[PDB]
Amino acid sequence: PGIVELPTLEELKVEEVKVSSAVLKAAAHHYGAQCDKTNKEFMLCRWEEKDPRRCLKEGKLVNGCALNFFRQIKSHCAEPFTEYWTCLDYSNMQLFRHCRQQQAKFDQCVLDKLGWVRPDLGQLSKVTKVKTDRPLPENPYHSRARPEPNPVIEGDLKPAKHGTRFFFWTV
Amino acid sequence: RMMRWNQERRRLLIEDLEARIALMPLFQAEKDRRTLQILRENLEEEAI
Amino acid sequence: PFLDIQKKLGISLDRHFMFLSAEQPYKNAARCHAFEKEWIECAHGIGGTRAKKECKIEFDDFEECLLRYKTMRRMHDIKKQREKLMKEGKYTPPPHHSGREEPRP
Amino acid sequence: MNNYIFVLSSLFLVGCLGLALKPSPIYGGLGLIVSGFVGCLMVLGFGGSFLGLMVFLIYLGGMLVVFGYTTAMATEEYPETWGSNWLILGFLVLGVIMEVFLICVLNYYDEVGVINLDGLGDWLMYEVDDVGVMLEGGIGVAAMYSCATWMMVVAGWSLFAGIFIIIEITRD
Amino acid sequence: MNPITLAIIYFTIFLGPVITMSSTNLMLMWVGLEFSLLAIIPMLINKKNPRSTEAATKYFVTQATASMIILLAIVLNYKQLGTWMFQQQTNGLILNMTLMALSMKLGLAPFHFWLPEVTQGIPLHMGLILLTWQKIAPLSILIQIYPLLNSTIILMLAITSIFMGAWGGLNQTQMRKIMAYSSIAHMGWMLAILPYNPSLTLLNLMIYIILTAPMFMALMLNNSMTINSISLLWNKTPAMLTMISLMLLSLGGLPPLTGFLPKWIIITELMKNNCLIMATLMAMMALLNLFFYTRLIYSTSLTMFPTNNNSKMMTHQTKTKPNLMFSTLAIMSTMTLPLAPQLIT
Amino acid sequence: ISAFLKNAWAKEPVLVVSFSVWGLAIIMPMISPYTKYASMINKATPYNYPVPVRDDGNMPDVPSHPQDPLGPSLDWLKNL
Amino acid sequence: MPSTFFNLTMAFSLSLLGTLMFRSHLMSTLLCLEGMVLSLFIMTSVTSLNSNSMSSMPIPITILVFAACEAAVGLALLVKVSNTYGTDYVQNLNLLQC
Amino acid sequence: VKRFFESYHEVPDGTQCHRKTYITTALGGICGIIGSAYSVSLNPADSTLEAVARVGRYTFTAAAIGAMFGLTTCVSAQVREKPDDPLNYFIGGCAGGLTLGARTHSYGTAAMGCVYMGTAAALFKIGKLEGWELFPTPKV
Amino acid sequence: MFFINILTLLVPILIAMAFLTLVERKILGYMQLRKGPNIVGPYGILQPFADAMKLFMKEPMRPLTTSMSLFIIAPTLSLTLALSLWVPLPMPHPLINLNLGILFILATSSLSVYSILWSGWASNSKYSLFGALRAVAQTISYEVTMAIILLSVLLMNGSYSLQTLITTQEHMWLLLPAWPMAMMWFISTLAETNRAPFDLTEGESELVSGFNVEYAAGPFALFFMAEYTNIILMNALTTIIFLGPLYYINLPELYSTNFMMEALLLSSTFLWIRASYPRFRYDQLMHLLWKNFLPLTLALCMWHISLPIFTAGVPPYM
Amino acid sequence: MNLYTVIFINILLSLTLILVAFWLPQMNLYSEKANPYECGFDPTSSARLPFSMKFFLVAITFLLFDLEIALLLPLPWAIQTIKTSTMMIMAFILVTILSLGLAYEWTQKGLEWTE
Numbered sequence A: 001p002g003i004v005e006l007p008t009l010e011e012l013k014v015e016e017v018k019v020s021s022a023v024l025k026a027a028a029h030h031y032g033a034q035c036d037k038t039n040k041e042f043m044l045c046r047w048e049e050k051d052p053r054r055c056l057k058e059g060k061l062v063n064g065c066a067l068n069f070f071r072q073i074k075s076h077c078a079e080p081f082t083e084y085w086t087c088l089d090y091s092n093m094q095l096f097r098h099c100r101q102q103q104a105k106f107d108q109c110v111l112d113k114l115g116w117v118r119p120d121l122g123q124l125s126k127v128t129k130v131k132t133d134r135p136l137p138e139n140p141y142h143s144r145a146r147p148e149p150n151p152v153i154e155g156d157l158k159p160a161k162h163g164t165r166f167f168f169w170t171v
Numbered sequence B: 001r002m003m004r005w006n007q008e009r010r011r012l013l014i015e016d017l018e019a020r021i022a023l024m025p026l027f028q029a030e031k032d033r034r035t036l037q038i039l040r041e042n043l044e045e046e047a048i
Numbered sequence C: 001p002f003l004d005i006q007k008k009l010g011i012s013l014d015r016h017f018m019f020l021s022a023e024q025p026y027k028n029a030a031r032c033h034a035f036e037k038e039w040i041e042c043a044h045g046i047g048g049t050r051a052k053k054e055c056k057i058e059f060d061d062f063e064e065c066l067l068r069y070k071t072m073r074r075m076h077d078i079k080k081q082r083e084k085l086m087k088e089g090k091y092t093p094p095p096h097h098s099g100r101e102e103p104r105p
Numbered sequence D: 001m002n003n004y005i006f007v008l009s010s011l012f013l014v015g016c017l018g019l020a021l022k023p024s025p026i027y028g029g030l031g032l033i034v035s036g037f038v039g040c041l042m043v044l045g046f047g048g049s050f051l052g053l054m055v056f057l058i059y060l061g062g063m064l065v066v067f068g069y070t071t072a073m074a075t076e077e078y079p080e081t082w083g084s085n086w087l088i089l090g091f092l093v094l095g096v097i098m099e100v101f102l103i104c105v106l107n108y109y110d111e112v113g114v115i116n117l118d119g120l121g122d123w124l125m126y127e128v129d130d131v132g133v134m135l136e137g138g139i140g141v142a143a144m145y146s147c148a149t150w151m152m153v154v155a156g157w158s159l160f161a162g163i164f165i166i167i168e169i170t171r172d
Numbered sequence E: 001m002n003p004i005t006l007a008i009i010y011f012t013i014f015l016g017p018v019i020t021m022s023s024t025n026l027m028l029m030w031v032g033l034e035f036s037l038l039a040i041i042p043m044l045i046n047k048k049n050p051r052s053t054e055a056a057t058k059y060f061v062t063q064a065t066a067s068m069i070i071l072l073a074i075v076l077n078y079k080q081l082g083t084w085m086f087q088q089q090t091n092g093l094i095l096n097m098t099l100m101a102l103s104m105k106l107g108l109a110p111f112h113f114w115l116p117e118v119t120q121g122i123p124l125h126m127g128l129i130l131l132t133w134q135k136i137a138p139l140s141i142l143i144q145i146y147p148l149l150n151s152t153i154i155l156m157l158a159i160t161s162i163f164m165g166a167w168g169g170l171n172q173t174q175m176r177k178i179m180a181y182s183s184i185a186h187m188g189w190m191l192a193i194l195p196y197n198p199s200l201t202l203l204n205l206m207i208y209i210i211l212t213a214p215m216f217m218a219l220m221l222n223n224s225m226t227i228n229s230i231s232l233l234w235n236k237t238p239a240m241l242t243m244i245s246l247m248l249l250s251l252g253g254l255p256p257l258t259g260f261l262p263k264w265i266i267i268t269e270l271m272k273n274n275c276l277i278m279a280t281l282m283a284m285m286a287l288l289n290l291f292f293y294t295r296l297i298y299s300t301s302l303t304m305f306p307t308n309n310n311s312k313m314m315t316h317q318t319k320t321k322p323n324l325m326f327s328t329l330a331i332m333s334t335m336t337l338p339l340a341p342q343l344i345t
Numbered sequence F: 001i002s003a004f005l006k007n008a009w010a011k012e013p014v015l016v017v018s019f020s021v022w023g024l025a026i027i028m029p030m031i032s033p034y035t036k037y038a039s040m041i042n043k044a045t046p047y048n049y050p051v052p053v054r055d056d057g058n059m060p061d062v063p064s065h066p067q068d069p070l071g072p073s074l075d076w077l078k079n080l
Numbered sequence G: 001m002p003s004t005f006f007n008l009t010m011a012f013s014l015s016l017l018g019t020l021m022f023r024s025h026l027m028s029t030l031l032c033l034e035g036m037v038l039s040l041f042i043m044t045s046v047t048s049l050n051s052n053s054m055s056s057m058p059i060p061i062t063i064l065v066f067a068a069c070e071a072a073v074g075l076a077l078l079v080k081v082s083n084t085y086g087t088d089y090v091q092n093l094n095l096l097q098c
Numbered sequence H: 001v002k003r004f005f006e007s008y009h010e011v012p013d014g015t016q017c018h019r020k021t022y023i024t025t026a027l028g029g030i031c032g033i034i035g036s037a038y039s040v041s042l043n044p045a046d047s048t049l050e051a052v053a054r055v056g057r058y059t060f061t062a063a064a065i066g067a068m069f070g071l072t073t074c075v076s077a078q079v080r081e082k083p084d085d086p087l088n089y090f091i092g093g094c095a096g097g098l099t100l101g102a103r104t105h106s107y108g109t110a111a112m113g114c115v116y117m118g119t120a121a122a123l124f125k126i127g128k129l130e131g132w133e134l135f136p137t138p139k140v
Numbered sequence I: 001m002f003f004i005n006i007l008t009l010l011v012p013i014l015i016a017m018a019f020l021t022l023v024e025r026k027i028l029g030y031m032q033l034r035k036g037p038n039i040v041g042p043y044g045i046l047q048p049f050a051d052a053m054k055l056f057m058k059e060p061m062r063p064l065t066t067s068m069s070l071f072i073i074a075p076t077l078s079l080t081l082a083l084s085l086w087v088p089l090p091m092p093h094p095l096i097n098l099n100l101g102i103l104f105i106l107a108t109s110s111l112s113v114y115s116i117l118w119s120g121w122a123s124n125s126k127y128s129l130f131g132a133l134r135a136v137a138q139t140i141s142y143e144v145t146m147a148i149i150l151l152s153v154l155l156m157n158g159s160y161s162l163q164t165l166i167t168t169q170e171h172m173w174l175l176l177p178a179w180p181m182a183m184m185w186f187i188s189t190l191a192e193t194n195r196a197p198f199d200l201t202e203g204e205s206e207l208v209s210g211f212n213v214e215y216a217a218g219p220f221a222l223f224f225m226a227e228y229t230n231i232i233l234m235n236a237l238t239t240i241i242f243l244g245p246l247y248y249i250n251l252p253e254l255y256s257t258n259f260m261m262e263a264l265l266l267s268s269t270f271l272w273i274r275a276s277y278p279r280f281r282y283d284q285l286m287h288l289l290w291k292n293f294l295p296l297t298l299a300l301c302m303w304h305i306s307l308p309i310f311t312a313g314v315p316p317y318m
Numbered sequence J: 001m002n003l004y005t006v007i008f009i010n011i012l013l014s015l016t017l018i019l020v021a022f023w024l025p026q027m028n029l030y031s032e033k034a035n036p037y038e039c040g041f042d043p044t045s046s047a048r049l050p051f052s053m054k055f056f057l058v059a060i061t062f063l064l065f066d067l068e069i070a071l072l073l074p075l076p077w078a079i080q081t082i083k084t085s086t087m088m089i090m091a092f093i094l095v096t097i098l099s100l101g102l103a104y105e106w107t108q109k110g111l112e113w114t115e
Ligand SMILES: CS(=O)(=O)C1CCN(c2cccc(Cn3cc(-c4nc(-c5ccc(OC(F)(F)F)cc5)no4)ccc3=O)c2)CC1
Pocket: I014, I015, I017, I018, I021, I022, I024, I025, I028, I029, I048, I049, I051, I052, I053, I055, I220, I221, I222, I224, I225
């Protein structure tokens, strides 16, 4: 019955990353500590609003922060990161345990020239708390007003008038 | 030996999955934006 | 139901996985989850006679999410009209509809 | 493609029809094996593999036992086939033709919620989780051990009782 | 049969209907039905005679077909509206095929041709179980979905069950088939009122059960399986003729016996819904049901058929049967109409 | 009884081993101090996204960042 | 999906038709029953995968369990029938007419 | 189609008599086909041709019964000008039973069928007049 | 490219089947104090080609009592499955990566029995039927323990995939923790192939040839090569599951080499066993698998269910 | 698609072999050659008669054991669950009940063949 609104092809245009997957897997553990704020704002805004149309500028900010991360990389430590993700793209599953000697060079490079530090075994896997300046939705499911329940008869219980009103029984 | 090796494998799995976690926001943004693009194209053509 | 033993002992042997809106493995979600949830929440505390009239909107949204007869009809009509056009030469699919597209990202 | 799952379902239908025509249980078990293979194929084409491989193994064992039994109880001097009896072959061909007719007349007079030859292959995998790690079918069937514990005890007791029951039935 | 096997099998028989009753999901109702029909068979075929084997076959095939149909209904109601248990928004075709299959199982007409045979081929203590304990789970299913059942179909089924039970038990010499047709008729009654009021079909079921169980006990006392055999009770167990006659007249539906109460309170609740014709026909044919019970009373108690030179021995000997429950049930099945208000609601 | 167990260990050792392994499988979980860690590990795995919460300003026990020293640590699994 | 379910329903109906319309042999009817089981299992699995409801996959496996138990007791009854009459024919168990 | 069998009550008796005849004949043929199915499945024949013979026999008999019923009913409604009278339907059921006897070659079946079908048809007319319900919906 | 890979996986398997017949004959000869083929070619490397060519040059038989359809389908299926079981095998990289590869193996193998069944039934000869029923018994015997052994092993692998066993054995064979299961699996693979001491499906001393007795040159060759291919297949399975070749991602060729060495060892062991032992009675096979292997198999399944728990050694899901 | 490709390639290889086996060689067909083989002499009957089975009970049991295997196979996934005690207990109960059924059959002499 009602129309469905959709953004325009320009309202949803960004500076895309256009970067492969092994490279992202190489840089993820550092991209988690350095963009947690914006990433989590976007994703909370996503689960809370359940609409990919209300939560779009946050995604553009996510893309921007990722681009800035990868530029901080491309400026200082392009070559170790290159070695790392090239070694890591060879495996049929892009495993870390096959490129440990290059991972260490990359992490030392960043620890030195950018102060970054690699997350530990279970830090990214947990629940943080993000502070946003957006209000809680009132009805994210857009549900209608629930029907009115049936009134509960009130009153103390008392025997039946003349007992069982069966055919010819006196009780 | 199998105990030790499977424990280290669990740890490596934690690592891979944490990488996936760090990356899921970007993928979600891209996927939503792309679905909206496809739907708007199909809308323009359904209008033509 | 006939012998509500469960509801007496306060257990759940067969009732925690009846409908799609129930707890699934690893907190996944069956499709039409929200429609089913809203139908159930509307039909709560009023009975099945009222629910057949007062949760009709919600049940129909659910039925459409699950079976999708109307999306099917709509896309079929669209394809039919497009085939008519192409037949009588009044339409040409744009590039992004013929494989040649800008593949974002 | 696009005609794939429909061809699978049609082959399953023909297998079940040739089964229902009741030839010697040898060829019936053959048709049942073929239908189970097709069912596996289609279940795999809908997303799930564990259930398909499962049903396939199960019916293979079952038809093994059924072969062993029919060679001992359900045999004849001249076992019947689909071709043996002109009437059975004729009704088989007739059933194929009637399936064709039903499909081609429902596409025309009926709506598209049942059979839509135009629009086929568009409605197989309605929704999916593109970023997903834990969607294998065996997760559900393993829920039996953790969540759906009732189905597990139920089936296990069914099998226990079945052992005792078949023993008692076969006692001479 | 060893006690371990007996334990497993009887526990399974008992468990089957319990799961069906105590379950919210239809699939588990189905597995309960299956437990029942898988565990009951060895108790039929235990005697190991051709009649027992063919009774077992006729029972198994029928119940398996009906179970597959019920399963199809459940699976369609799952494909539609994505839940297991039925709902108001469910296809009448599904509901009606479910009802038909449940009738097939119960043995209602015209799905009854297998019950008389299956009951004639087996011993009596199993016929008792078959006709009393195995008719509940189906009725549980039907009582959980009574608002959704079509009244046309159940009413046609009910009048058919009544007519066929009467006409069939009318010319039976074997007692087991008489009890089978009595079951068919009383199930027709149970079902004729189910959508309007299912608190009355449970009443009729309880009454039919407490009525048929002691009849079967009597038959098992002297392993009586024919009219000519029970005709010999005046020489073997004349202390049973009173209870026999009263239970028969009650089963028929004669006042002042509590076998008339189901008939009466069902006719009432039907005419409260303007079902004059159905109740009329049902009563007029319950009369025919009563007819052969009366012929049987003649044969057994109200006259004395010839006996044999050997029953003198049975007179010499002693007897440990029956137990306490026969008298209890036979008294609470004839002399309890005065308490009808307590029975009805 | 020892003689019965002995003549069985000599004659039918396969059933002896079967029952013994049955009992050990049923017992050792009650015995080991590394049994509690199975569920802890299967819980530590992030098969899903750790959906964040809104900073109402009353979540002192909850962290603002992965590398913020708050929440469950996995050291017990890093050195096990 | 809809065509698949229509064809599987038609297949169940054909197998039911076979089960109802006996021939000399009984094992053929047992096989038709197994075919109905197959149809229903497939329909249920397809529905659960189309709905992404991984909490209902434990259902079809139970279907298979109980179907195979039914088949087992059917085969046992078949054994007894063959021992009695020497064959699995249905026209031989017609003595309960009285 | 049910609109067909309901066309019987679109006009009162003594009208569209031929239509009533056709409708009642079709209904009789229906019932005869049902009975023949049940009589060939159970108590089968020695030959398929003999089974088809039995089918046609029962069906033509039922059709003739329905024909006479409807025809005589509408004729009596046309002659004595009492459309709302169960007595016309009694006469019709009686002619139908007399038919049933003619076919079976039994005067006893003729009399019994008359006195039973007449009662049944008269009660059917009474139910259509006084608005009875045969298979009513649960209302309480 | 994929078709070229199909060729590089198929034609070598058939050449290996042929030279496996060769090695069988020569090993059994030297064990029997004789030589084995040395005349046809240098040390006999042309006897298999001679046999095959001669067979496919002979008059096949279309008897009068046979169901020709199944009579012809059965060998087709036998060979097809014997060649299809080789596709999901990692050496160390498979041609078809299946998550449920183990179940594919199980199902295809349990299906290869219907070739024997339908052949023996179609042939319509008593010895053929006897071979078919013996195959029925053999399967009913071994198939129960096969899957439970395999599950008990996989409960430390974490999946039914054949490529996770490589990382599982990355440090140590699965024979050490599962050598009982390895022994039982070895004998059960010995039975799956209808191979001595379980050559009951074609027992020449009781049943002239069993299900082959009416089959002739070409189809018989198909049956025979399917047998001698499934042999190598099951050896490869044993040596991918319980024995672990060296996997260094920069060196899969070493993996293939060691895989081949171990497969040759296990196959030569099959031949050794054929030469060393008499033949069972097909009831004793059932009694064995149901009284010594199944109880122990259940006990070990429970043991390996518990071991990951009271050791915290539960494997990962990918 | 590749699995289909490989399997069809194998179908075609087998069928080619059979074609060139049935059409390449010279044939000379006659009844005494095409007749069944029963060790030099003529069959006394058809091979399509009831061949009694002495392990029918063991086959029936094999069906149920195959189902129990089907129920045991999801363990590789059931061990990834948080509720580990429940999985352990249920697996142990299942295997124990299976073994008890087998033991009852054994003792009552079901695994032994009718003679
Ligand atoms: C007293 S003993 O202990 O010594 C005793 C031990 C057993 N033994 C033995 C062992 C192995 C083979 C044989 C010869 N033999 C070969 C074939 C047969 N082979 C091929 C075939 C197809 C394609 C091939 O590859 C290619 F051609 F390239 F495709 C290759 C071969 N078809 O059918 C069939 C039957 C047969 O007996 C004999 C010797 C005697």
